[PDB]
Paper text:
L-BC virus persists in the budding yeast Saccharomyces cerevisiae, whereas other viruses from the family Totiviridae infect a diverse group of organisms including protists, fungi, arthropods, and vertebrates. Totiviridae is a family of viruses with monopartite double-stranded RNA (dsRNA) genomes, which contain two open reading frames encoding the capsid protein and the RNA-dependent RNA-polymerase (RdRp). The capsid of L-BC is organized with icosahedral symmetry with two subunits of capsid protein, named A and B, forming the icosahedral asymmetric unit. Decamers of capsid proteins are stabilized by domain swapping of the C-termini of subunits located around icosahedral fivefold axes.
Numbering used by the authors:
A (entry chain B), B (entry chain A): 1 to 658
C (entry chain A): 400 to 598
D (entry chain B): 499 to 598
The structure:
């Protein structure tokens, strides 16, 4: 769904056609200008940060596994006459439709019996999913995965790719997969009984020598060596695949270019009228394509256990009964060919749509994790209250699109309630502390991180405990579309806090909200302050994340209640503007303004520049030549948003109906 | 009748087409949120179970035996001209109709004489019944039956499959039956005198190679090895079967799929004009598709002796008189094709219609068994007063439909008073003791159950004496639509147990009604209560079921005087998500509230999900409006043009609609 | 075939029965792949003009041309100026204005693709052999690429890219009879024609 | 801005080429383009004294098309305004004050 994911990008940013990705890691952000103004009891001070880079990091590494499941049928592309006055498939009219379009009327009773059983299981989403993955393996087939490389690196702790991904070796993306080929047989017209558990698809003219090899490899098993996002393990779709081609198919060549895969997809969709089936596969890949690099070491807990990708079962009966597919197809929405027309024009745009989607999900799960398990809307019952359709199960895409609705605060709508794709909320839905394996870089590691072994040596491999899951990403593209108090991602804001009395060289902050505001100010001024949690006896630091220049309360790494002892004597000066002061006095007022946003992308510690021309808009209106909006709002999936209502605690988040 | 069985299903239940059954046991039910409360002089203790599963276990096994009986003729199908004003065959118009036809002139006088006997032989219910069973045998053929498997187990008493079903070998449903084929001869139109005691049917065009194999096996003896419900014992319907098909009958193929049986049925109903015959066969199979696993150990008395199935004799004389069947048939009700049209569209919906019917019957036979013989509407005379027709004998479908009418509280209407199918009320009407076999687990069994021995070592085969039949199923689909105080299936309920501090926990229940509600609500709260009768000296436990989680008064297994001593310092916490009664003092007040309902099904201790399209309420009007429409768009290939439009680039072309 | 005729004439075609029998033409189009047509060479300077597989080929050799986009197989003659498009430019009256200054020594660069097509076409009616050279790629195009219609379509370039056509107007050669001469132009040129009667 | 195909942007028009190199000079980016007709390299940093670009620095009267090298854009003088990668329609609005 192009028009949906295209809306998530910020109004100022309009990306160009091509993007030459040449690495397994891409930073994306913006260069903003901050105009700070400070006032306290001592006096006033005015400064200005001329260039500030706020960015996340996203990679092509994510452990996933495929399962074949049975899902709903997509009834789009079938002729409009077999459907009655309502949006329902009548078997009374299928008998009539097949009868009028043949001379041999002996086969009508047999044809109707088989058609009735097959039409209620038609889904080509799993075939297009694999065909799309083959396109990007050939295009970006020079990305290197080194086993003894770094995953996260702060200075105290470190995670290698040996950990998080065991049973892996060093390989390029083209060298990862060695796909076998399934038998692409020809369906001779005259066969009366459709062979069971084998799909048949239509084709335009002669099946090319290259088109055979693509369809053969798309249906086969995926068995990777290196952990890659677009080369994840998938079960075998089918053994055979019939093709009702008037001209006979040619034998498989063995080799194909990425350009040849586009020609295979464009023909397969046009012949079968499977435009809505492609839209499902497009959204399903937008989830998988890229995975987040964690903000802090604790945010690696999300990516330990392998998330399951629900691939629908491959079934189709267009090859057997080509009478059912004619020139007047049935569609629910009039904008039902937009997603394919967008991809075929601008293939590399999927990267930006993928980054936009996975950001929105992992940002909002930062809030859902902090919700107490004694309210109406909680981690267990947030999807069920949101959805207003009838899917098979609240899994895959339904979970992800619910989180996008909660982020943007708008009603998202799909034509069919499809439940296919990655489920992320697995690490969240379990009342157990997660054991992230880490490497010790400095001797003073146990003071900061909640480590098992309290005495360590540089080189030792230990384990750290994570109870509450912290935010994996900060808002960048979705910055200021709706501002929560937790992130505090405002354009303009006036922070007011009262400074605690400095007894010896230490200031006690008993309250939780005041402590968050204090360290948030001192960070924007650019003062590396270090405080001691009195309950646990572990040191917290506002400079936790360098990439995103902000302080979240989850950097304390202790759910519950505590009091902090801030060290006011050892306040280091890392980055100093003219605003920056060391000695606060009385009531601290900081008023900042953010202006002059401009998007910038970094890859392999150099600037990554966009190539090609400017993207012209392709989009169809609500009506072509349709008079009355026959609402048909019974079967269509609808996802209602939730607004965060702030309360006194500040540690707990709460959702309400707007 | 699809219509009346559809209304039995709950409002929240939204069924889909396909149901992938892969076992011989299904736990259908619903998930509800129970808000329990315990109020006392000391204070209130609140609990909340967010997902409480109330289930009824249903199996695919059950001993049945078919017998060929004489039943009324179904006159729906014959041309409307030969019928008089009253609605009976006016012989004289038959002789007129045969004379003005394409019949051989020398046969008219001899055939007209036979008409008086042969035209009143119209009942195809037996053939359609067997052909429906062949459809489901080949569809769900992979289900297994093990000999030494657990039929029932409640901890104390165990009942194996060897006990109830001797002469039983372990085998799959597909490998159970080995059906021999009956002769399908071609009717010679130039036959001198019609052969009575040999049925002759009509057919459209040519009898296919697979249709011969299906009709051959349908009119044959069912001799099963494993006691399956859809493969029970049936006698040989007929030896030979004539088929008036001018196009010759092809010889038997040998093999056929489940889709080929649907092809055979749709041709047979259409040619013979026998839709009311199919409606009778649909309701027959709805009774005897699935049998309920007994709720308690002593509720196995219903399934000891084999209940007889009444199959009406196969008799059809359409082959001899082709002229009398045409396109203008005589029918009583206008909605006479609705039952077939429903089955062809949604075959797997019969499973839901079957469980709805047996749950309605076995619930009502529960509270019919607890009435004294000295009454107006009693055990023996509940069918006679309800029935306002003229059936041959009050058996089969009449006894099952009258029990459904009592449950729902509505008027059930059928077009013909047909008396065919299973008779359930067999063990009830006998009014004698039934001896169910049991294998013991513990050594302290015969205190609880009314056993034949008083001391029994573990692993011994004993006998339980059941006098009054307890309810076999708890109401789940029919929950709080026609509520009785016996089952106590309310949304809101409360009980007030009155105790004084002078009593050291010990309470005596003089009333029987509130004893039942106390013991039931304590089990929702997850507390194992063990009462002891003061008069007799037996013991009862509220934990006497692992499906519904309720206490019915028939679990006492004795009718006498009511003096139940419950000691409230021996209450043990058994389940999870439970409220604690540590030490009560004064008057106790228990209460619960069920708020929302969600349909759930379980199989092999895993969730069984419904897949496929959205099932609609098919009406007679929804198809015949498309017949009124006719697709009246004159079938004329009108090709509309597209004017090319030039813009800035001129290299690429752009087409407009006008 | 009937739906293509409906687009050409711009009318509604009606048949009594929706019959689907006859030849299907749209075969090579829908494939959307490269087609390898065989050719026997005459001259030795062939592969500059045509997108050939070899760069040096001796005369009488059997080579292959790579065709990506399908050029028009026929020019409109019976359907001339009934439903006119700017691609074919099948007007009765037409004109083009090529703007040059005396400081330029005959050399003109066509930034626009549309008026380059009309200039090269009208010069062929006037019987002048013009040979343009693309500045970006470095290939050559000749207006004399047909002996039937006598017009220049833009698909005769045999390449889709950026438009920078250098035409040197002191290498124009008079080829045909009944021709107007461009001996030595100075300033703005204005070409025009008029078709009056048809037989 | 012209579409950057490989690492080269073709400027067919004369006026647009003058405005492009005039902007990049004020930002302070030493851009070098190749004249396709002559085959000689033009540079916007021709005169250091006067900080502006005139069209006569091409040194070819007549008509031509320029191939601008977008990969080899050096950074001689950088203010905070100065960017290397232009995208779409470029707008530059400057004000001159405080003459002495």
């Amino acid at each position: 769904m192009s028009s949906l994911l295209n809306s998530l990008l910020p109004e100022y940013f309009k990306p160009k056609t091509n993007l030459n990705i040449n690495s397994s890691r891409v930073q994306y952000g913006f260069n903003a200008r901050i105009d700070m103004q400070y006032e306290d009891d001592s006096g006033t001070r005015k400064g200005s940060r001329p260039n500030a880079f706020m960015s996340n990091t996203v990679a092509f590494i994510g452990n996933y596994e495929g399962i074949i499941v049975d899902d709903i049928p997509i009834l789009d592309g079938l002729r409009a006459d077999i459907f009655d006055t309502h949006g329902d498939l009548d078997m009374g009219l299928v008998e009539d439709a097949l009868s009028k379009s043949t001379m041999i009327r002996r086969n009508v009773p047999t044809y109707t019996a088989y058609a009735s059983e097959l039409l209620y299981k038609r889904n080509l989403t799993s075939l297009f999913y694999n065909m799309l993955r083959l396109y990007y393996i050939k295009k970006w087939g020079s990305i290197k995965y080194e086993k003894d490389a770094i995953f996260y690196d702060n200075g105290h702790a470190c995670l290698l790719n040996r950990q998080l991904f065991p049973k892996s070796r060093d390989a390029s993306l083209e060298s990862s997969l060695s796909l076998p080929e399934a038998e692409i047989a020809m369906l001779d017209p005259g066969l009366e009984f459709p062979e069971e558990d084998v799909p048949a698809i239509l084709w335009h003219g002669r099946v090319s020598s290259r088109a055979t090899c693509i369809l053969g490899q798309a249906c086969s098993e995926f068995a990777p060596l290196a952990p890659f996002s677009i080369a994840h393990y998938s079960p075998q779709l089918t053994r055979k695949l019939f093709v009702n081609a008037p001209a006979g198919i040619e034998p498989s060549s063995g080799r194909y270019t990425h350009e040849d895969v586009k020609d295979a997809i464009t023909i397969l969709v046009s012949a079968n009228q499977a435009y809505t089936d492609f839209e499902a596969a497009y959204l399903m890949l937008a989830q998988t394509l890229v995975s987040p690099v964690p903000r802090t070491a604790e945010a690696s807990a999300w990516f330990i256990n392998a998330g399951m990708v629900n691939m629908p079962t491959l079934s189709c009966a267009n090859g057997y009964y080509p009478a059912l597919t004619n020139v007047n197809p049935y569609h629910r929405l009039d904008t039902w060919k937009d997603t394919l027309n967008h991809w075929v024009a601008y293939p590399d745009m999927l990267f930006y749509h993928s980054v936009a989607m996975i950001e929105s999900c992992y940002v909002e799960l930062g809030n859902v994790a902090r919700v107490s398990d004694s309210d109406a809307i909680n981690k267990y019952t947030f999807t069920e209250l949101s959805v207003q359709g009838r899917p098979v199960m609240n899994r895959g895409i339904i979970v992800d699109l619910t989180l996008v609705a909660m982020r943007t605060g708008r009603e998202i709508s799909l034509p069919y309630p499809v439940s296919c794709g990655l489920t992320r909320t697995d690490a969240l839905l379990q009342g157990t502390e997660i054991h992230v394996p880490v490497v010790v870089k400095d001797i003073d590691m146990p003071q900061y991180y909640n480590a098992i072994d309290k005495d360590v040596i540089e080189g030792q491999e230990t384990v750290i405990k994570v109870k509450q899951l912290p935010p994996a990403m900060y808002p960048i593209y979705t910055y200021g579309i709706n501002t929560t108090e937790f992130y505090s991602d405002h354009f303009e804001d006036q922070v007011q806090v009262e400074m605690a009395p400095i007894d010896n060289g230490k200031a006690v902050f008993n309250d939780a909200r005041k402590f968050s505001k204090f360290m948030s100010i001192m960070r924007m001024m650019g003062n590396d302050v270090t405080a001691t949690d009195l309950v646990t006896g572990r040191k917290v630091s506002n400079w936790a994340d360098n990439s995103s220049g902000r302080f979240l309360y989850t950097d304390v790494k202790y759910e519950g209640q505590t009091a902090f002892l801030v060290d006011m004597d050892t306040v280091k000066a890392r980055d100093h503007c003219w605003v920056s002061i060391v000695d606060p006095n009385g009531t601290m007022n900081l008023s900042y303004k953010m202006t002059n946003f401009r998007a910038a992308m970094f890859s392999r510690n150099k600037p990554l520049y966009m190539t090609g021309g400017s993207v012209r808009t392709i989009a169809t209106g609500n009506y072509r030549d349709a008079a009355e909006r026959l609402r048909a709002m019974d079967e269509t999936l609808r996802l209602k948003p939730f607004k965060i209502t702030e309360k006194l605690d500040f540690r707990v988040a709460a959702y309400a109906i707007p």
